[PDB]
Symmetry: D3
Subunit: 113 residues, 6 copies
């Protein structure tokens, strides 16, 4: 629009679902459950990626990229971490994507200050 | 928020989309360009429907019969919230967006209570 | 089914999608091919979610407070239908797809009464 | 309607969405509020596209070569239906929504014959 | 590709999605991990449906009656293409993806002919 | 997945539709047509953005960002150009987004060489 309402919480919540699904995949080896878990994980990781991408294209502005010169690469690393989580059943991959999003969330809130 | 049961629900998702609705209403009051007005209408329509989807999901996928027994007004509160969001969708008045936010806040309160 | 409002609602939309869920469940018992099993699982997840959406729309956008007054079990019926569709979503047992259809049929019966008076 | 195949098809899905298109068109003649006009336009674009999708699915995934042999006008009928839905999409005139429903009704008649034999 | 009539159609969109389908089939032959197999099945299902949507759109929104008169086999060619894509969707054999690409290539040829 | 099939042509085709719609908006002042044109433009610009974002997150890799150190900013500029086109009826905005995508397309094809 823009309307100006952004919050990395959207990206965070979806990535939390990714990790939560990967964790459930460890405790239920039923093939149908594993398949559904895979299906859901794939959707949620892609929605998390979309939320991170929207922050980067629609919310962050040149003065933010000036002030935080590592921002472009951080967002790109976050997206690849989400791709790695969606390709894995290991909750450590989910967690890494969450740790990256946390770094974006800090930067975001600093820029609202 | 998609019955795995994965377990992760947060009314923040409904709230953030409804906050977008209200923000767009506020903006439509300030700029009467027809193209902007149209784009605002498009966005508002999509965000309000996303907000309704998140609220519906809490209601069907997160809340359980023990909750509906402990909070007998919850079903109607959810229905009113969805109707408040449809009302905001159809309106440019930010007070309609705020009313939808107020209803979501009541849901959020109950939600965090069931977490405690 | 769009909250314009346009006033075009019909539980047939929920029913068709829930019929698809059950049909997929029945096909999963007839073909153990892992690739087919996975595709069936993909489809069922999608159709079950659309069914839930159609039900939710009827409840939020079609049914009104007089209907809720007149049918005080209706809120809980709609909730049960959605949970039944979630249970079908999570299962290969066509009994679960059937149970969801049974609930939809009950909504369908209320709906058509409200179209008379 | 998913090409699993699950074998659950019904032109009712196309018809309901095309009914919505016409209902929206009729509502646009009754309320000149520019905001309402725009919302009506948003909704109609969406419902018309879903209608086209349902028709296309019946043609690609339900109808088979014997049906095409037996009903040699069917390809062109399906094409005309989709173009009619595009014309409704582009118009506020409910006559266009009606014309699209007329075509769907013709598909519906063929469909149900193929369910008998 | 959405009847404005905006005018911009290119069978490349159908082709690129069908090329993705074939690429995923080829990959499923190389790696029998169940999780990878599932993810490949998910992706293939989505891309094949996108390809079918693009082909359907050319057929309803781009091609006109003069074209169907000049190319009387076009309707059935489109129907066969959609069925070839549904066949690829249901298969792991890259030859099914290639067959769908072959049918799309026939459409693409006719398409560029109507441009000349 | 990845499967490895990427082509900036997807982003290009959608952005071409954006510009084509903006051009049609100049020759038909009917309010219903202007509204539909706005609706369609909004969808196509967002699909173009999604295609550009996917290239940047899923196709480009660290050695590409090393070799082309202007790549992150170019992709970000391309996305904001698409946002500007979706907020405008001026075909010059559509064209600018296309000119940016053209720069990405050149880089893409170099990296396949
Ligand atoms: Ni969930
Ligand atoms: Ni409606
Ligand atoms: Ni089906
Ligand atoms: Ni178009």
């Amino acid at each position: 629009l823009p309307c100006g309402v952004y919050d990395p919480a959207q990206a965070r919540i979806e990535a939390e679902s990714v990790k939560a699904v990967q964790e459930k995949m460890a405790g239920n080896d039923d093939p149908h459950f594993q398949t559904r878990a895979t299906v859901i994980k794939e959707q949620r990781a892609e929605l998390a990626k979309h939320h991170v991408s929207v922050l980067w294209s629609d919310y962050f502005k040149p003065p933010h990229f000036e002030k935080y010169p590592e921002l472009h690469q951080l967002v790109n690393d976050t997206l690849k971490a989400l791709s790695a989580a969606k390709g894995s059943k290991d909750p450590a991959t989910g967690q890494k994507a969450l740790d990256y999003i946390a770094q974006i969330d800090k930067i975001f809130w600093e820029t609202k200050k």
